[PDB]
Amino acid sequence: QYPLSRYDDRNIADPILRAELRKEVMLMCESNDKNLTIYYVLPDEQYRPDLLAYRMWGIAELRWVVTLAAGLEDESQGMTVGKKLKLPPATWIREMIRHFQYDGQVIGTLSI
Amino acid sequence: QYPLSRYDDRNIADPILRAELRKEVMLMCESNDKNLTIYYVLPDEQYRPDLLAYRMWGIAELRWVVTLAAGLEDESQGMTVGKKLKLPPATWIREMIRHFQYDGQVIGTLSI
Amino acid sequence: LEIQEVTYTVTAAKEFLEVVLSKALTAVCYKLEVFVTTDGKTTQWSSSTMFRLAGSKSQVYVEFYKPS
Amino acid sequence: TKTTTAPETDSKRTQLFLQSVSIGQNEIPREMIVGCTYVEPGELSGPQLMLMIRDSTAYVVNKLGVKFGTILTVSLGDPEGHGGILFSEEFFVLKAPRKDDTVLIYAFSNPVRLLKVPSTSAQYFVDKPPSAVVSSLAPGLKVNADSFRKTSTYHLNVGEKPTKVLQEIARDTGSMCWASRGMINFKSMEKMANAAPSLTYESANPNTSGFTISQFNILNADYEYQRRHNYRMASYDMTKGVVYSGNQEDPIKFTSNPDPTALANYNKFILPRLDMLVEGNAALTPGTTLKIVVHNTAGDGELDESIPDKMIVMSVTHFEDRFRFVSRAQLGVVN
Amino acid sequence: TKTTTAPETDSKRTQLFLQSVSIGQNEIPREMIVGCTYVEPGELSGPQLMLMIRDSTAYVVNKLGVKFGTILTVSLGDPEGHGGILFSEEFFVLKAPRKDDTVLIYAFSNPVRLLKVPSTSAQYFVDKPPSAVVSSLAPGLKVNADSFRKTSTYHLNVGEKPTKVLQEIARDTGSMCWASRGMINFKSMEKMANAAPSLTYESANPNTSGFTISQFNILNADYEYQRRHNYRMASYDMTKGVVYSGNQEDPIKFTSNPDPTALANYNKFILPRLDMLVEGNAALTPGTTLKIVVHNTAGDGELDESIPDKMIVMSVTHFEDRFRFVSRAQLGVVN
Amino acid sequence: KTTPTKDSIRAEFEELVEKDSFWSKFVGSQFVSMLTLFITQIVYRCFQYADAALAEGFISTATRRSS
Amino acid sequence: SMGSVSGALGTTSVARWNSLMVWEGGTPPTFTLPVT
Amino acid sequence: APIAYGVYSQADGVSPYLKVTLTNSQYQVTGYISQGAAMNMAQNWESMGSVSGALGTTSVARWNSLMVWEGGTPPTFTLPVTFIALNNPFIEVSGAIAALTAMISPELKAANVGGQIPERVTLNIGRRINITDVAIQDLSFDLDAPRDSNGYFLKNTVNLQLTGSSIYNSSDIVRAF
Amino acid sequence: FIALNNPFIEVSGAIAALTAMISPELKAANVGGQIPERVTLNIGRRINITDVAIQDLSFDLDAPRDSNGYFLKNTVNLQLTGSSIYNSSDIVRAF
């Protein structure tokens, strides 16, 4: 068998239900919390989000976060050199993927 | 009672049912797998497959494998000196013998 | 009569692709029917004696009995 | 009302097996926990947990109020080790004594705790399919079943646990039960014997492509478990007379249900064979089938034929101390 | 068919207690056995055995196939030590786990194993003498009895061991049972109190002509065993009414058999007094009467009057390791 | 499989390769792994592009202000 | 350490193999360096 | 054919009676004898006995009046070998240490189970004491020895502990001399 | 030991003899012969003990050697013990 990493957003099989997780991640990446890191796109990371993911977190499967935060749809378009990005830690995104993968409910849902 | 070594092909009592195990061994010996060993027939091993079986594996009861791979029905027929042989490891042979002794089904059978 | 099924997927074209049932299932057997499903369409494949008059498009198969 | 909130960004630390423990929306610092023992059994005895927490300042019991009825939110997983799985469960605390500036917390899984409560009033299911009974008794778990055939009648008296009826259903259907990770499982015994393995465990082989066993125990006492099931069942039916089932050369034993299908499955079980200790795999759950290869470490490297090729997992115990993560399993074969 | 063959001439070695072990006509090398424990109890619980065999090459269980149903031929004796006796017996293996390159074999004596099998069908003996019942239940042992007087009725139900009926016969006759060395023994309790001793055991005497005790235990708890037998028996008989037996100042207790001879012997037993450990005597079997003399080792060499002069052996345990041969016994007095 | 990992594509190549004189020799080797990874990159790009565009198509499920 | 007894021996090969010393484990190399 | 090392040659003028050789299927190491070599053996003679059970049939059954035998050990050795270079430092001093270090280690990548155990050597002290199947247990050497201009040792000293593989009988141990 | 006339008889044979006396004989048929044999010790001419057991032995390997390879001098360290607890009257007889 060939499993998937716990950091992959593909863990949610429906491309429409992944919109909640993507929205939450992007909303976090535009906020100003105290646990955020500031990273500039180096001249050699214009076409390679994998290199940025490896240099920032040490995990290479988080390239979808880097693609999402830059505002792109494909990896074939180059990012602008010198764009400021803010990235959250890996544990948060990992539990966020798990949340929508399992609970799926929206943050703030009222239950009895 | 005289116990038969666990590496003997006589472990299957029917000469017709042993044909499937022999076919599997011969099919493996002719493949191009990555954990086979290449052995050339030396001038003093022309009539003695037991010496080759002892020199390669360290077990003398594996002479039937050498006779099979070389392409002879009789042990008194001399092998061609310098013939290239490919021979598998011993644990694989033991596992195949156990499977065909205690289960006796074709490798690609479908069960429910 | 009771009905039970088993399925096998194809990874590549092996040019004969023999499929063998288990000993217990062959012990209790009355009929055999073969279906092939490709891009959402499924059809029966008829049997033939050897391959006597079919070629290059006919959907046929041949039954055989192993020594076991 | 209960609100679903997002995880906090202050938890940047990754651990081996135990990731975080919380009481409501407040977190117990993880460095204070020095022990952890998680047990997944092969019957309806539910997953268990036990935490040893160092408390010298009198904080866990005094100011947090940990006693009977406290609900813990525990995140267990191993996203980097041998098996990259991750899940969250809720636990219910039964007792927590304090000794030597330390607290030992004994917890039970909440969905199964609700199934281990004595009944205030009696419920009878007359001529109901087993699926309805299972759904009505445990309405909070997903049902995974493949061995339901007929319909029958079940009774739950006053003071009896609902788990008794589920175990009776399992015995009548001939399946294996265990509730873990949000599911309740019924799996037939005849189909388990024909299942292909998923993992490979080897000993005395350092060039293996699978994992490795460090310690193992061989049990040769097969009579100890077969002694209790060596009987010929008999029962009384008002329209047929006396109904027998089983062998012909065994002593007779009387039961009450005169159902031939239930009588036939009365003597099916799994025979334990081997116990082994490995290096912390979090993917080992009951119901798993493994391939085991054991080599000898002296003489001439002979394979041990006394251990069968394919085995089923029956019980799993995971254990983490402050330095190492270990797992223990019990393996068995279907009779 | 089974053939009786002569012993081989390749066994030139003499040992202390365990002489040789064989499985059929093949011999396990004796130097591989590192433990041995042989137990002869004073009731019908049969002689037991336990062997610890060092197996690092995986030979005993793997290639010889030792599991439930293996019959061992064991030669036990001591032809040179304190007691020059020698005999051969057959044992039946129940289980044999393997741990740490070692195998522990648990065995039971075959003639008694056949007596400890649950009955597939019920047998009733109506108005039969006890000798016929004993011969029919155990047709493979020699009968040694002196306390059979009358005739009565006995019942053996489905699932019950044949040993239960023999124990009931012993209780009704007032005798002591033990099956050892190819015989089954019934010996009356009243005649045992008047038997002359055969051996002499002394302590703190280095000029003794007998043997010597190295360690001994004094038990003063005579109420612990007399508590259960302090009752006045009563039962119902359809032609006599209520039948009493026993003392007059004790509480009443009901049984079922209204037989005056059986009622009279209901409260007879042997009271244990002393446990001792000696230097490996192989002539000590249950039923033996010994003379015991104990001197004190300080003060003024006063004799201990709290130990009676004549005692009976109740249980015997023999034990051999790789360096020393030891025996342990439990001694008692008839009430 | 709908979700292509490197292992799945390498396994597909290995399954297709066998029973050939030339290719079966190099089943386990560095070159095959590098080639398979280099090819998997395009498949990953196409699948993720389709998913992202489908998600961002609607207003209700759009993740960016510009869309 | 201690050898053994109740035996010696005149099937046979396996008995001797058990008697032979056993290999139990090892230790990685260590150093003691007084730098200056 | 094993590979030679150490001071095996006769260019130095020392008799073979003052040299120790360790031989196995891969390497052969030769060195001198220093001032602290020795050979050791031991037996164990003896709790369960008491004063009240003594006396003022074989002698083995009476363990309360006589002494009993429990076991013994195989012969042990402590050899502080010495090497000194005279012609080529690598094959004499800097190669022997590596050879010994290889002989003490296991080989876990071999196919058979018996090939993974550290191998056993043959010990021959001078020309008159020869023992087979000797297992190497400990080893040590110093790191402040004089160095050559190329960085190889010009002298060294190795301390070894060796043990037997079985308990010897009275008739067999005489043959070793 | 120190050799004066014949090294093999005086220095190199004594060590082999002692190494023979210390070890058991496990190929023997009877049980009493399997335990190592006991020795008679006589210290000078005035102290005699019977049935002593040797429990340790040692000797040097850096001793002077002969042109044929035999020892010319050596030293053996021995540890000996009695085989029973002596009585007051018995132990005086040893002197």
Side-chain angles (χ1 to χ4, degrees), chain E:
Chain E
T1 73
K2 184 173 162 175
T3 316
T4 308
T5 66
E8 216 75 38
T9 45
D10 296 332
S11 285
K12 298 190 217 174
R13 280 199 296 198
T14 311
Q15 316 279 336
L16 296 167
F17 180 63
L18 181 67
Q19 308 282 343
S20 90
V21 178
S22 314
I23 302 184
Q25 267 88 340
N26 298 326
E27 216 184 357
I28 301 172
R30 156 81 177 117
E31 72 209 2
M32 280 203 343
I33 307 164
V34 280
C36 181
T37 296
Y38 180 69
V39 168
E40 289 185 0
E43 65 269 31
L44 271 177
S45 97
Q48 310 170 1
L49 184 78
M50 205 217 89
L51 299 164
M52 164 164 39
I53 299 182
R54 161 179 189 63
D55 170 31
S56 89
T57 49
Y59 178 74
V60 175
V61 177
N62 189 353
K63 301 202 171 191
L64 288 176
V66 177
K67 24 180 194 210
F68 178 77
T70 309
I71 301 173
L72 310 164
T73 305
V74 179
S75 271
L76 303 162
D78 185 4
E80 173 270 356
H82 287 278
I85 208 182
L86 195 83
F87 60 97
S88 204
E89 280 217 278
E90 291 189 357
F91 290 99
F92 185 91
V93 179
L94 297 172
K95 89 188 187 189
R98 177 178 191 269
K99 229 205 222 174
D100 260 348
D101 303 343
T102 325
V103 177
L104 300 156
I105 298 177
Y106 296 99
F108 207 82
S109 180
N110 202 10
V112 185
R113 197 273 312 180
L114 268 172
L115 287 176
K116 297 254 188 200
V117 187
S119 171
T120 61
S121 34
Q123 305 162 268
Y124 302 157
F125 299 100
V126 173
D127 285 336
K128 292 291 214 196
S131 315
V133 175
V134 175
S135 159
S136 162
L137 279 175
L141 297 171
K142 249 203 277 177
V143 181
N144 192 354
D146 53 353
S147 60
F148 292 142
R149 289 201 84 162
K150 300 197 293 181
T151 182
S152 46
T153 312
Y154 304 107
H155 273 235
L156 177 78
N157 282 325
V158 177
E160 294 206 344
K161 306 179 185 166
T163 298
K164 184 173 170 176
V165 178
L166 298 176
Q167 223 59 357
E168 190 179 359
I169 288 175
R171 198 179 53 203
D172 293 349
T173 51
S175 47
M176 179 196 176
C177 296
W178 70 101
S180 87
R181 302 162 200 250
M183 315 204 31
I184 186 173
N185 295 319
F186 296 101
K187 297 274 186 197
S188 174
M189 294 263 198
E190 61 154 31
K191 304 193 181 164
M192 260 178 138
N194 286 327
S198 54
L199 301 165
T200 300
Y201 276 120
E202 305 192 5
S203 161
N205 200 345
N207 269 339
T208 180
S209 40
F211 309 108
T212 298
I213 308 171
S214 54
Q215 304 179 357
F216 73 101
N217 258 266
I218 293 184
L219 322 173
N220 220 350
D222 309 341
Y223 186 69
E224 190 165 9
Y225 316 111
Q226 284 185 357
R227 193 177 67 174
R228 314 151 201 200
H229 293 99
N230 282 333
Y231 280 116
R232 188 185 160 186
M233 301 295 128
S235 82
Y236 181 75
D237 192 2
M238 218 144 172
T239 45
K240 274 125 88 175
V242 178
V243 178
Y244 298 108
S245 147
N247 331 290
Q248 263 304 110
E249 71 295 19
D250 281 346
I252 202 173
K253 182 171 170 172
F254 275 112
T255 51
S256 64
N257 195 352
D259 198 4
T261 305
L263 280 172
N265 297 324
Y266 200 79
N267 283 321
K268 288 201 209 151
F269 64 105
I270 292 186
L271 196 75
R273 286 274 194 94
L274 189 91
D275 293 350
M276 58 168 217
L277 192 82
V278 290
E279 323 167 21
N281 192 344
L284 277 166
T285 82
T288 322
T289 308
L290 328 166
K291 174 185 169 176
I292 299 184
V293 176
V294 176
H295 293 271
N296 188 5
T297 179
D300 282 358
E302 296 246 341
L303 213 77
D304 279 22
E305 304 274 339
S306 41
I307 299 163
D309 199 6
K310 328 199 292 184
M311 314 209 85
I312 307 169
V313 184
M314 307 167 65
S315 171
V316 184
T317 294
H318 308 276
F319 169 88
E320 151 142 24
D321 73 0
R322 35 204 281 258
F323 301 117
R324 169 98 169 178
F325 171 51
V326 190
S327 305
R328 179 173 192 219
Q330 183 172 11
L331 302 162
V333 181
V334 184
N335 236 5

Side-chain angles (χ1 to χ4, degrees), chain H residues 98-146:
Chain H
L100 293 170
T101 321
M103 299 206 278
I104 199 165
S105 313
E107 180 85 71
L108 286 178
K109 301 175 231 153
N112 206 355
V113 198
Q116 294 171 0
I117 311 180
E119 88 178 300
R120 298 148 213 69
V121 293
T122 296
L123 173 72
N124 171 266
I125 301 169
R127 280 304 291 297
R128 303 282 192 185
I129 304 171
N130 188 3
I131 300 184
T132 45
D133 282 8
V134 174
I136 299 186
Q137 267 198 138
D138 280 20
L139 168 145
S140 157
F141 66 98
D142 72 8
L143 288 172
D144 163 77

Side-chain angles (χ1 to χ4, degrees), chain C residues 5 14 38 57 64:
Chain C
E5 316 173 7
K14 218 191 61 186
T38 280
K57 87 275 170 184
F64 70 104

